[PDB]
Design a protein around this ligand. Structure first.
Ligand SMILES: [Mg+2]
Ligand SMILES: [Zn+2]
Ligand SMILES: [Zn+2]
Length: 900
DNA sequence: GATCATATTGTCCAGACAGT
DNA sequence: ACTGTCTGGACTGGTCGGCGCTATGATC
RNA sequence: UUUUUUUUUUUUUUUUUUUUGCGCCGACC
């Protein structure tokens, strides 16, 4: 059968294990000869694997691409210290007797630590603290309790140098260098019983194994060799490092065999130690990194695992995948929110493997007969034996007549297929959702507009990735869990995320506003466009010139369910006295007459009774993101499919309404009368006079300092407050003369796009430009620009733009606005990286937490983090405004349903 | 004029550490 | 027991494409 | 007129079915 990995046990490889697992001994530094054949005994020996296609492995007998590679070994002439175990070696040497070999602890202390180790074993932090305490206790001891032999302090010098402070005959203290052979001999005397006290395992990690005597050379598959376009081989950095190691080891062995003096032996030993240390880690502190001939700092085994481009993050936690596509996205309101537009070229390339069954034999046979060049067709066919056959014109008929039950047909992407649609960066779980394939002739992806806010995607050149699941389990998981309609409500705040946007909101406002009426032709056309299942028109609301007319509220009410009742205040409510009468009428009777409601109907108060929009207008509070009460109620009380249908119908209806009525903005939308401009100029002049008076008072010393601040900050705060008040007054003056008939004002007030402040800047004035919360000061001595006098603290000299976008900015005001915009762009480009790093840290901290079947949240070890998730066991996605149950809404809905 | 060994050894935050 | 100092580390994801670079000195 | 060496049977053919890495620069979202 098949087996899976249950657990992984780590340790230090013994020299005997390295020798036994080795397939060959490497002694020749050279890799390839002049003819290009591998050299026997070299680093590219065929016993370690094969890279070239024509080569055959002497250990496996297989060809390139399927030989896994085999490890070698190098017999070092002298032992060397592993740089990754240097601190542990120093700690163990400090914590152990030099000649006796036992740990410098009493028997009672050893027993006490042995019993304490069993109690604290689950938490690795407790074990680390116990190890540190044992090391600290054993370090201060200068006499071994087991034998009474005197001890000397051991000094550790980076990277792998150990100094022993021995005492001379006259009492002088001199440093004695401990060679790796002496260190290994000292480590060999430690018994197995003291190893748990030192944090080592008797059978897995012996202390003497931390001093390397046999170096395992990696297989050639781990360090592949390529050839360039000019025929010159490009060896890996590990290959060059191993070449240097082999050369130095051979030179050291030859010098040892030649009886060289000890001075040469120490130099060669140090060179070999440096080479081994750089091979293990080329970024070790205090070590000059190994450099290539061209000057390139080589990357080694340590660099291949850590970092963004390491083995873990770059190849294990994340990697490139097959059956994926990426292209520019384009809007498509005609498709549903559950659908994605797939190009025909993309569909004809990406394939889904479908097994031949009894109920789909004819379809797959037709797909095979069509071939790869005829849509809908197939590209590959897999027999039950498991081999893959490519489909072409010559053999498409032979395969088609040979098709049977159990075959696999890699047909092209068809309508209704489930694929993954993703936009980067993936900040939340809504960044990847499963859509339905819709095949289109052009070369762009198509995404429905309400699905843009979950992706945070616009259409100014955005590109998105498409993934096609290949297994039945993955397809089922995508279809059940990751469908678009299943994630309308955002789990972050428990509100709508897949909601209407600017044009939908504007069209809804245009349709549902007071005085909006449509002819029979317009109503029928918008009903056909929206796909609503309406066969007969309702009774006309009024007649004009002998022609029937339908109110927009009547057309909008066809979308709502017949048993839906809700009332609230939208963003268009500017006269609360009109909403108060409606609220009192609703409260008094709880079933108000529809004629009575329409008599005192107000656009700012939306009231839906039994699915009929009796009052109010559609805005961002209707079905907008994070504010749509109607959409949120529809999701919670009618399911996700009904909500998806409602969204698909209402988006098309509002799009038709806004398209044929005519929505536009012009240069006269920001126009203001002369009296408004005069008032704005008067406000600006008054603010400038106030700033000048404050400056004069500060110069005369009459300014009262604020608590906790000196005169300069007090004056700056007063000036900024005055300028902000002036900007607010100018904005109010501009808002006074901009009525509801303005399309830009409609867009700002309905929440479709933009703000009132955006219209204020173009109409009245820009205001004060500031960076880092302070007025502009960077420039010359005492002045931002030379055009102003030195020492001028006035508003105009510090970044107060009196002009507006329509009036035209002065060059100084242009420079100030450029400073502000640069500050904003820099702030965004700096904040993004910190936010991403914090998100990665949080993800890695809370990756393993999940809710068990009993409602508890536990770590993989088993420690209970929460006895109930959220202390109430309620999903934030299904929570009503952060609460457990919306009691008032339930009571009101039940009472209305039973009394209606 | 062809080949062959050899080719060098950037601020900030947090934990550990001499000094008083 | 505090306090300033030395040392280690990580530096948001994806995508697009381009542009170089991967021997040399001394015999026989 | 003289010592201290030993001896024997069971394993077959002329040969065979797919550019990695390094660093830089610009740019999109
Ligand atoms: Mg964009
Ligand atoms: Zn092999
Ligand atoms: Zn001892």
């Amino acid at each position: 059968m098949k087996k899976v990995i249950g657990s992984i046990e780590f340790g230090i490889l013994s020299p005997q294990e390295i020798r036994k697992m080795s397939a060959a001994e490497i002694t020749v530094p050279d890799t390839y000869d002049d003819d290009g054949y591998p050299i026997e005994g070299g680093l590219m020996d065929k016993r370690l694997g094969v890279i070239d296609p024509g080569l055959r492995c002497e250990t496996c007998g297989a060809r390139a691409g399927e030989c896994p590679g085999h490890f070698g070994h190098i017999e070092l002439a002298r032992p060397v210290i592993h740089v990754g175990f240097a601190k542990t070696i120093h700690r163990v040497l400090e914590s152990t007797c030099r000649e006796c070999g036992r740990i410098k602890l009493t028997d009672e202390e050893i027993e006490e630590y042995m019993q304490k180790f069993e109690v604290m074993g689950d938490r690795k932090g407790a074990v680390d603290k116990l190890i540190k305490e044992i090391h600290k206790k054993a370090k201060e001891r200068m006499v071994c309790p087991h034998c009474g032999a005197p001890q000397f302090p051991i000094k550790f010098e980076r990277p792998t140098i150990y100094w022993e402070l021995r005492k001379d005959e006259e009492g002088n203290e001199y440093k004695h260098r401990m060679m790796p052979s002496e260190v290994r001999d000292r480590l060999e005397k430690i018994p197995d019983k003291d190893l748990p006290l030192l944090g080592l395992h008797p059978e897995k990690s012996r202390p003497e194994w931390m001093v390397l005597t046999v170096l395992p050379v990696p297989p050639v598959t781990m360090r592949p060799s390529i050839t360039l376009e000019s025929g010159i081989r490009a060896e890996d950095d590990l290959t060059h490092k191993l070449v240097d190691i082999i050369r130095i080891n051979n030179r050291l062995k030859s010098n040892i065999e030649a009886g060289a003096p000890q001075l040469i032996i120490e130099d060669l030993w140090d060179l070999l130690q440096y080479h081994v240390t750089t091979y293990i880690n080329n970024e070790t502190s205090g070590v000059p990194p190994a450099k290539h001939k061209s000057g390139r700092p080589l990357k080694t085994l340590a660099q291949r695992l850590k970092g963004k481009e390491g083995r873990f993050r770059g190849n294990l936690s994340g990697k490139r995948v097959n059956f994926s596509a990426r292209t520019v996205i384009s809007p498509d309101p005609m498709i549903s929110i559950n659908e994605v537009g797939v190009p025909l070229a993309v569909a004809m390339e990406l394939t889904v493997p479908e097994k031949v069954t009894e109920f789909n034999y004819e379809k797959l046979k037709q797909r095979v007969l069509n071939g790869p060049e005829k849509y809908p067709g197939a590209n590959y066919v897999i027999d039950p034996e498991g081999r893959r056959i490519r489909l072409m014109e010559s053999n498409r008929e032979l395969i088609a007549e040979k098709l049977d039950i159990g075959w696999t047909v890699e047909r092209h992407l068809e309508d209704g297929d489930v694929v993954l649609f993703n936009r980067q960066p993936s900040l939340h779980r809504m960044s990847i959702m499963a859509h339905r394939v819709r095949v289109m002739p052009y070369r762009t992806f198509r995404l429905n507009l309400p699905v843009c806010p979950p992706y945070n995607a616009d259409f100014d050149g955005d590109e998105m990735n498409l993934h096609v699941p290949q297994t039945e389990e993955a397809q089922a998981e995508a279809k059940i869990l990751m469908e678009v309609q299943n994630h309308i409500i955002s789990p972050r705040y428990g509100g709508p995320l897949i909601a209407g946007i600017q044009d939908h909101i504007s069209g809804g406002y245009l349709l549902t506003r007071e005085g909006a009426y449509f002819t029979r032709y317009e109503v029928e056309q918008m009903l056909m466009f929206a796909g609503m299942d309406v066969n007969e028109l309702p009774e006309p609301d009024k007649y004009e010139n002998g022609e029937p007319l339908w109110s927009g509220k009547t057309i909008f009410s066809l979308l709502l369910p017949d048993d839906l009742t809700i009332w609230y205040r939208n963003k268009l409510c500017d006269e609360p006295e009109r909403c108060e009468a409606l609220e009192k009428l609703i409260e008094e009777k709880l079933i108000p007459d529809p004629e009575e409601v329409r008599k005192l109907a107000y656009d700012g108060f939306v009231y839906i009774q039994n699915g009929k929009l009796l009052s109010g207008a559609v805005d961002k509070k209707a079905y907008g993101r994070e504010d749509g009460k109607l959409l949120d109620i529809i999701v919670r009380e009618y399911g996700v499919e009904r909500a998806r249908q409602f969204l698909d119908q209402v988006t098309k209806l509002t799009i038709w309404v806004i398209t044929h009525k005519g929505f536009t903005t012009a240069i006269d939308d920001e126009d203001l009368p002369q009296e408004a401009i005069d008032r704005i100029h008067e406000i600006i002049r008054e603010a400038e006079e106030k700033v000048q008076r404050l400056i004069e008072a500060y110069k005369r010393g009459e300014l009262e300092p604020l608590p906790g601040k000196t005169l300069e900050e007090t004056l700056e705060s007063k000036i900024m407050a005055v300028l902000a008040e002036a900007r607010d007054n100018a904005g109010k003056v501009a808002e006074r003369y901009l009525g509801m008939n303005n399309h830009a004002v409609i867009m700002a007030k309905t929440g479709a796009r933009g703000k009132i402040l955006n219209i204020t800047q173009m109409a009245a004035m820009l205001g004060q430009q500031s960076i880092r919360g302070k007025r502009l000061y960077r420039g010359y001595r005492g002045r931002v620009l030379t055009h102003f006098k030195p020492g001028d603290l006035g508003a105009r000299a510090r970044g107060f733009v009196t002009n507006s976008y329509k009036s035209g900015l002065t060059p100084q005001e242009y420079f100030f606005h450029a400073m502000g915009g640069r500050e904003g762009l820099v702030d965004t480009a700096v904040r993004t990286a910190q936010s991403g790093y914090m998100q990665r840290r949080l993800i890695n901290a809370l990756q393993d937490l999940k809710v068990d079947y009993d409602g508890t949240v536990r770590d993989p070890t088993g420690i209970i983090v929460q006895f109930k998730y959220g202390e109430d066991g309620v999903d934030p996605m299904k929570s009503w405004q952060g609460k457990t149950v919306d009691v008032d809404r339930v009571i009101v809905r039940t009472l209305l349903k039973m009394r209606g």
